[PDB]
A paper describes a structure:
In this study, we characterised the TphC SBP that is a key component in the cellular uptake of TPA, the breakdown product of PET plastic. TphC belongs to the TTT family in Commamonas sp. strain E6 and through biochemical and structural analysis, the ligand-binding properties and 3D structure were determined in both open and ligand-bound closed forms. As with the tripartite ATP-independent periplasmic (TRAP) class of SBP-dependent transporters, they are symporter proteins driven by an electrochemical ion-gradient, rather than ATP as per the SBP-dependent class of ABC transporters. Here, we report the biochemical and structural characterisation of TphC in both open and TPA-bound closed conformations. This analysis demonstrates the narrow ligand specificity of TphC towards aromatic para-substituted dicarboxylates, such as TPA and closely related analogues.
In order to understand the open structure of TphC, we sought to crystalise TphC alone. A Crystal structure of TphC is shown in ribbon representation (α-helices red, β-strands green), the structure is comprised of two domains with a large solvent accessible cleft located at the domain interface. Residues (P28-D37, PFSAGGTAD) map to the motif [P∗-F-X-A-G∗-G∗-X-X-D∗] which is highly conserved in TTT-SBPs (conserved residues underlined). Superposition of the open and closed TphC structures highlights an ~36° closure between the two domains upon TPA binding. Overlaying the open and closed TphC structures indicates the movement of the upper domain (α4–α6). TphC shows a 36.3° closure angle, whereas previously resolved apo- and ligand-bound structures of Bug27 reported a closure angle of 24.7°51 and other periplasmic binding proteins show closure angles ranging from 15° to 60°58.
Numbering used by the authors:
A (entry chain A): 21 to 314
B (entry chain B), D (entry chain F), E (entry chain D): 20 to 312
C (entry chain E), F (entry chain C): 21 to 312
Amino acid sequence: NQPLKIVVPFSAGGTADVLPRLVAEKIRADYAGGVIIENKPGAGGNIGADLVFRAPPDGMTVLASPPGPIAINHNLYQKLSFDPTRWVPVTILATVPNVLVINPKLPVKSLGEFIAYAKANPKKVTVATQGDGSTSHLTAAMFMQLTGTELTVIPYKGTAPALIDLIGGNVDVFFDNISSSATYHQAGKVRILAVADEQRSQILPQVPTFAEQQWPAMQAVTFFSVVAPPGTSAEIAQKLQKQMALALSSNDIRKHFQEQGAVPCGWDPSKTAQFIRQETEKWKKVLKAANVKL
Amino acid sequence: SNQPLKIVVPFSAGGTADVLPRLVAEKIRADYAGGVIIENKPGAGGNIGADLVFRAPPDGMTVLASPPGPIAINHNLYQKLSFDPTRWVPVTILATVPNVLVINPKLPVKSLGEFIAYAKANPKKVTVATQGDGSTSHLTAAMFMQLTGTELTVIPYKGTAPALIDLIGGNVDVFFDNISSSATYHQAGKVRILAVADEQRSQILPQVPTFAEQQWPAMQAVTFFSVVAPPGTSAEIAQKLQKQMALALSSNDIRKHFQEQGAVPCGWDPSKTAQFIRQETEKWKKVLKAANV
Amino acid sequence: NQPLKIVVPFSAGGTADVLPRLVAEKIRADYAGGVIIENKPGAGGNIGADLVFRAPPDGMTVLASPPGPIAINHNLYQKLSFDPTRWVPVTILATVPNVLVINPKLPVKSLGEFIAYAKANPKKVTVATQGDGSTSHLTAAMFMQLTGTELTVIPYKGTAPALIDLIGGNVDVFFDNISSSATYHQAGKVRILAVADEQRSQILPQVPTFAEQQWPAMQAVTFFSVVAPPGTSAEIAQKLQKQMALALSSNDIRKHFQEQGAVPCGWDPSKTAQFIRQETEKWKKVLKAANV
Amino acid sequence: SNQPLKIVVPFSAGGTADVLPRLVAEKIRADYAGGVIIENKPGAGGNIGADLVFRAPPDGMTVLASPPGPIAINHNLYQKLSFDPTRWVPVTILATVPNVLVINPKLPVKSLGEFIAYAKANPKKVTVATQGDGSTSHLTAAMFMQLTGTELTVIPYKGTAPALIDLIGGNVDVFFDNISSSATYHQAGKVRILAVADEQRSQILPQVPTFAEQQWPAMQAVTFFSVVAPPGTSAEIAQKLQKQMALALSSNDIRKHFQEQGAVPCGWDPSKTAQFIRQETEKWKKVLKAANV
Amino acid sequence: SNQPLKIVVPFSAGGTADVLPRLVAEKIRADYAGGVIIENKPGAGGNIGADLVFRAPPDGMTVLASPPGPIAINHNLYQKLSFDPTRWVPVTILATVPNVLVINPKLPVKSLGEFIAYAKANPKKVTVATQGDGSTSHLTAAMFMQLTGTELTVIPYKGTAPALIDLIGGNVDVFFDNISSSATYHQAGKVRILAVADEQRSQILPQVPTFAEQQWPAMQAVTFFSVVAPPGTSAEIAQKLQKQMALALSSNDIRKHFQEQGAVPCGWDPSKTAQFIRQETEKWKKVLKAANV
Amino acid sequence: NQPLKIVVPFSAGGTADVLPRLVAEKIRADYAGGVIIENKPGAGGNIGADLVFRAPPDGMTVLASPPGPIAINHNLYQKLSFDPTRWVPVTILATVPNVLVINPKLPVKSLGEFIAYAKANPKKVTVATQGDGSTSHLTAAMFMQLTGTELTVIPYKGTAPALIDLIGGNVDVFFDNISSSATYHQAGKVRILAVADEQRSQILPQVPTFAEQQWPAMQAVTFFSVVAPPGTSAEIAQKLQKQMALALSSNDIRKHFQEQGAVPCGWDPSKTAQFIRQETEKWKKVLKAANV
């Protein structure tokens, strides 16, 4: 019969695309018609999100996305064609931590010294972002708010131009995801001072968390969710989450996740909904205190 | 006709954009039995007020007195406008006010030449205050960056006051302000004006040299205040109004009140006004393009 | 040597402030101590009115005000600290006319067609106001009572949001003052169909009056009055009116008035007193009927 | 020179502090080929604007026009200032506006004498409104207390408007306001002004007696408006500007406009101006001392 | 114990607010040797009658039976009240009556979903009747707009009756009425009820769906009828009365009579009641803030 | 072995100093190196707080303070060198309640009549404070906000001048702590009408709480906390809390605390952390609404 269709509201290739396709190959065994993955990029995930939001609530069309259209965009975009608060949560596939990365020529050797250095030179230290609302912008804003520091933003079109400047010393700080920066940290081109998560990342087992360094409130991960259209029954959503939780349990899948810097979750629909609710409220505070609404 | 002339200033009352046309209105009231009405119609960088004039009857009884936004910039700056600035019927240029290079005094530089070299040795390390993308201070800083081969990191501010606060405090390094705003802080040692981006020095600060005197004649960045009439206004009607305004601008007391705003009267004829507006439009179009704003 | 004091019971900047300050420049010559103008806004003019109503009736403290505390508010507010029927009238400085403004998409191109259109579609045409008792509401109610038309009232918190909706086609008609709507008419964003005054306004010389379109009774202007405290002698009022009528005669001040959309008047105290009584009874009637 | 004169008023536009210098400015524009600029630089009781002139060149092309705060008060009120008001070069005194004793009408006293007796018979029972320690209404009330040996309980307010609300409403008993602010409420019976703290009566209220008339000549408390120039300004330069402003202050229209603000023009020469400021500085420094104990 | 219980209904006799407590009164008379008085004390949206109970002795012999105005709404709607609803001692919720979305039948939509899409595609073009700011129909309209991100133009009316006349006559487009009022007109085809803002359908019109089952479960807007006691009434006294009323609400005759008003009996205990009132209070406080700027 | 160091960010001799020292003597048996108490006064407790906020987070340096640097000062001072939200809570040692004190000449005998007397005469009743931010100011504002009464604020440089005027009838009410006003209440020089706590104070057993007079939301106590530097493990905080809870359980500690008007608490670190957040948000709201 009918295949399950999973819409990733981003282009193919990245972690946003890799993780749902990995899961798809495992649950293909549960669907007689198969599993279609489609990439529908545009407007921070809002174009692809709208196509699932309007689809029939039978659990045969779902959206697999990082937090944009799930938890952020209704507080970032002045107007949306859909309400993320009406999504039917299915599960959280995984999380990927963000990290504090610095150019090595900054005269600091620790997180604490870097905070003192920024406090003593307000607005003199520059921080790279991917534009207003981007994960790296929001994480820098959370960091600034928690630590009482003021960093001067420099927006970049992509991760690659940001790192080129970070390595060259033309921008001082960057709140990147661990998978992007690890290789440059290992080669000494940049320095990762802390991971904004509850545990360290096995990509860089020696890099400590913010929490180990007296900053447990600094929690900033990119979480990959599966949501169903409004009106999807709790039963249908449970059945799919349990298919995906079983898919996420094998060992090869967990390795392929770790290779993206991602830890599998597979929480039930109730924990998923509570997590999205908490993350939504967290970033709303950050956006408001930073006065960011595009 | 006993119908008053109406002048729309597409910005809030007070400020140079409002002062200069109201000064001129006092004089040309003698030319209008029904008088002269000045209205302030702020909104959207001047576009809201511009649009109200753009759609008015082309009889020369409704004109727009505005700085360059809806005259020569916003159609290259905004995604989409409800009007086309290239179809304005030019009347005259009322005045120009020059922008200047202002630096925080802590910068280890004594001259424009040393500042330029300092910025070159430290790409993106020197910060520049702006009033947002497209504002005169952003466009002036972009022109400077493009001419001199330097890279300054932009910090946008909501108004001029918060930007000067940070400049005096050392939280931002540079600001391309207008001479009138920064003069008092320069005289007090709170900031340092290094160069006026104009053809002549400003009498506000007779000792501050231009960029052109310091090996940079291309750095020319003034705010010009124009009068324009709706599309289809005859050249005869436009020239009659320009001659009235030109006579207004020749009084000595009007020129003093202009100088007190940092402004130099112009009053050029519609042909030279149209040519100036085309030159400035293309100048800033190239600057916006190179900066990709 | 004591200066004349003129209290304007409204904030600085608007026409209520401009016109008495223009007259003040001219009559400073009759007062060795000068002329003070104070703005005392609050409660639709009532706060400032109360301050003058309690002042000594020697002619050295006057209220210059639009109609609210002069002719309307005692029939609008449930209680006032002053009685507008005891004001000692000095003069009417000027009038500014109200106008009939429509969204341009209404399938009507004249006053006559608009009245007919509303007749054939009772309650289908909506009219913006600024609350009950506001000038746009009273003028709308008068229009309905004279033409026997039925308009559905949509209230707004101010003129700016009303005009936004009128221009956007979310409300159909608005009875504005001429100086507010003129620029939007010239821009084609609205259409003024008629001026509720005896003569056309020189701001929009081609816009006809109600009177020349067979509705002379539709007379709705904001008048700017000067009044003195209770018990001010008739002679003291006459003397002040003469000073102000002389101030209103120069060309320059009359032109500055027209720039506000205002025609200078300067009527003597007897004609001013009769005018205010007529206006007072007119708006009382309009209120009663609209409130039914 | 073609450089304009700059007058900094270290307060917001629109009040008496701004109105009086602006009136003088228009009259002396004829003396300056470059015109006269007036800027409003508010902040910190006048010290922000004051500092900007104190640091400007002492050529007489930048001067401060201000009420007494940064001229005679604030170095004895604030802990640390960036400038020493005793080093100002005085130019002239533009005008004075007197402060007055205003009471709630329900107080069972009809005259200043009866009020002073009433406060004596009920120490600390009569409450007095202020705008905070150091404000004119506070210093004037403290002078009154020290002179008459009375004790009033001090209730501070954020500004004049809420103080007057409470005075009219009987929530505070007394207020030492300036005559211009309270006159309309006195005329309406909402308050009663008992005495003007000046050498002569105010023509706004010709029937209100002075403290002097009622055997208290020492109660002299006016807001005086000064023009001062930066340290190092020559006596000759200060004299030249004072003579220009004296001529402006002698005209009859200036007189009337000043009176409409409750102000009387002065225009004293720089030597009398300096002596007046020294005396007021000592007076208010003495009052601040006794008050803080 | 020989004193009658007194129930004050702060509205006029005749309506649901009067019917439901009077039905309950007939059953609980068995518990009061002196009987049960019901008084109607209308005025100021319930605040006059509420004040009379709020000030009564907290012995449980005087209670207020009221819809939400003076229980959960008015202290966030009126600028000031003589009493604080958050200090009421809750007893029980007697019943809920749901509000519904009612449209003129000429609107080119046949379902809630089509209506929402139509409004979003024509912002401010669809008009909505209310009974003034703060009225139940206005608050329910504002909640609908905030949840759905739609914009409706508000037309206020003096009461329900003129609103329905205009709705039926096509002079206003939508009205958020209570089910009991619109049902007959829906059945006659003079209006179309599209959805009920409640957890379950109303038996008045079993075929009309809820917002919830059409994917809008957050659209929950009912008129709830509460019994509250004066501040300081012991929890025990409140429990005793709630238990008496819950027993009355379980009788078959009373439930039927409640359904005839469009009301569902509740009878919750004082703790669940207090929770619901807090939730509803916060709910409408948010709607009021987001609505009035 | 290294002593435990307790920094009290206020001068010796007051209740803030007495209570931690009493506890220290009881926990000296748990520390082979002893227990040091230091007084580091200055800037409302901020100077001494800063010295602990920067100390090694090993449980050997702790701050024992009233609420200023624990829950208030970041919402009151423009900038602090530390962030109170990052303190690692240990325990609440004790609370001391504030009370409503009036001059005996007010024509009221109860809290009820006082609230009514002020409602009927807004702004006529005056209230003494120690300046904006002081506990007497914050408690007065909370009262005003909860009861919708309006009192006119008279500030004083300290408690003693305020009591002089309260007794003298130059100010009408004062929200003092129980220990300061009790003696004057017993002498009839003031009248305490209500204690802003959950239970009555044994210093004045006959004086009722706000809560038993139908105002339980009126809870205003000075609480004395122990906090550890940021990053102090929860285990270290728990060990210290358990030591202080034992010290707080002795009857002789109860008595010495009561003699200060204090009741021992000794709650675990989780309840302590919850309490501090509740009090922080409480007084943040009071400040906001007060400054408007």
